[PDB]
Design an enzyme around this catalytic site. Sequence first.
Site, PDB file in Angstrom:
ATOM      1  N   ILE A   1       0.802  -1.191   0.000  1.00  0.00           N
ATOM      2  CA  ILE A   1       0.000   0.000   0.000  1.00  0.00           C
ATOM      3  C   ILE A   1       0.853   1.266   0.000  1.00  0.00           C
ATOM      4  CG2 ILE A   1      -2.066  -1.077   0.919  1.00  0.00           C
ATOM      5  CD1 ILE A   1      -1.246  -0.601   3.671  1.00  0.00           C
TER       6      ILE A   1
ATOM      7  N   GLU B   1       5.291   2.822  -0.661  1.00  0.00           N
ATOM      8  CA  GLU B   1       6.755   2.703  -0.828  1.00  0.00           C
ATOM      9  C   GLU B   1       7.314   4.097  -0.803  1.00  0.00           C
ATOM     10  OE1 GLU B   1       6.029   0.831  -5.194  1.00  0.00           O
ATOM     11  OE2 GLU B   1       7.738   0.013  -4.058  1.00  0.00           O
TER      12      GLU B   1
ATOM     13  N   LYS C   1       4.596  -1.744   8.470  1.00  0.00           N
ATOM     14  CA  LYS C   1       5.509  -0.833   7.839  1.00  0.00           C
ATOM     15  C   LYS C   1       6.889  -1.376   8.161  1.00  0.00           C
ATOM     16  CE  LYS C   1       6.128   4.171   7.318  1.00  0.00           C
ATOM     17  NZ  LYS C   1       6.187   5.535   7.917  1.00  0.00           N
TER      18      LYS C   1
ATOM     19  N   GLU D   1      -3.006  -0.610  13.129  1.00  0.00           N
ATOM     20  CA  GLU D   1      -4.353  -0.820  12.691  1.00  0.00           C
ATOM     21  C   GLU D   1      -4.473  -0.382  11.229  1.00  0.00           C
ATOM     22  OE1 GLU D   1      -6.532   2.182  15.182  1.00  0.00           O
ATOM     23  OE2 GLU D   1      -8.312   1.821  13.999  1.00  0.00           O
TER      24      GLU D   1
ATOM     25  N   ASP E   1       4.657  15.642  11.447  1.00  0.00           N
ATOM     26  CA  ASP E   1       4.770  15.401   9.994  1.00  0.00           C
ATOM     27  C   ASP E   1       3.405  15.186   9.399  1.00  0.00           C
TER      28      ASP E   1
ATOM     29  N   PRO F   1      -1.753  14.931   4.068  1.00  0.00           N
ATOM     30  CA  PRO F   1      -2.936  14.165   3.674  1.00  0.00           C
ATOM     31  C   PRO F   1      -2.696  12.655   3.585  1.00  0.00           C
ATOM     32  CG  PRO F   1      -2.896  16.217   2.475  1.00  0.00           C
ATOM     33  CD  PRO F   1      -1.588  16.122   3.204  1.00  0.00           C
TER      34      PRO F   1
ATOM     35  N   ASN G   1      -0.933  10.831   5.536  1.00  0.00           N
ATOM     36  CA  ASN G   1      -0.898  10.219   6.882  1.00  0.00           C
ATOM     37  C   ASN G   1      -2.252  10.257   7.537  1.00  0.00           C
ATOM     38  OD1 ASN G   1       1.889  10.140   6.765  1.00  0.00           O
ATOM     39  ND2 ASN G   1       2.120  12.034   7.872  1.00  0.00           N
TER      40      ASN G   1
END
Length: 278
Positions: free
Chosen positions: A7, A9, A30, A78, A124, A127, A129
């Site tokens: 999802i 990179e 991740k 999650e 940080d 949009p 995140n």
Amino acid sequence: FQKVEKIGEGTYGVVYKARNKLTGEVVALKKIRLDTETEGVPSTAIREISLLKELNHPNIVKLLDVIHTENKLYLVCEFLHQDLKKFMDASALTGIPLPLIKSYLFQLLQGLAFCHSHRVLHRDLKPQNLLINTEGAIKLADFVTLWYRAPEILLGAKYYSTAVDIWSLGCIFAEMVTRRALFPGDSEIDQLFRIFRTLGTPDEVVWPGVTSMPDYKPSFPKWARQDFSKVVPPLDEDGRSLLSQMLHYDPNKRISAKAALAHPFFQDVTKPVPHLRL
Ligand SMILES: *CCC(=O)Nc1ccc(-c2ncccn2)cc1
């Protein structure tokens, strides 16, 4: 748990959707290459990261587990199906409905009020995140990036405050309304100039202490501040009024997340659901 889809990179490494074959549980995984020559993760890093595991709020994507070896750090979070960047891409023509922008901004301020009251800053926010579901929820994840960076950070403040997250959220609010990034800097100076051209070139009056910033330059060009009706057409006056306070130069005058929750923009807040196609 088994990788089922990629999802994300980037320079950091990669994010997978992973599914437990027995329970169906799905998580985001991740995977981060350490490049510390087999030394593992800096103790500072894991301690900062491990502190995030304490955040327990419905508008914060839960950090479920940390796993690290000599080579790799794996974060298990999650999973939610879409990010706000993707959604705003998909909503390019008709835009995000105002009641939904309203709901998302209210929810994100609840999450930041929580973090900020527990002495944690995101730093940080962008949009990409911000994750959304088909239930109308939005949540803060991952605790250019340039485009959302507060001016005190760009000017080299050694200590920054929770107010840097309000700035970022304000830029995101503007972007949901106008369907374009508010300050899309092509360089770190262009980033500053784009801010100055909109809010006015800062000075000691508008921002006491700006002159002590390491990167502050008396030689900056002098622009005048623009009316927000030009910056975010066609948001109503309640919205622009709140946006302006979230974008004050002075981190001490910038509105807090707890104060923003009481703003009259939120008077008629509800919970629309977006139409997503997964
Ligand atoms: C919490 C650690 C982390 O990095 N989590 C995370 C979750 C989700 C995503 C994501 N999910 C769906 C779509 C796009 N990005 C990235 C990172």
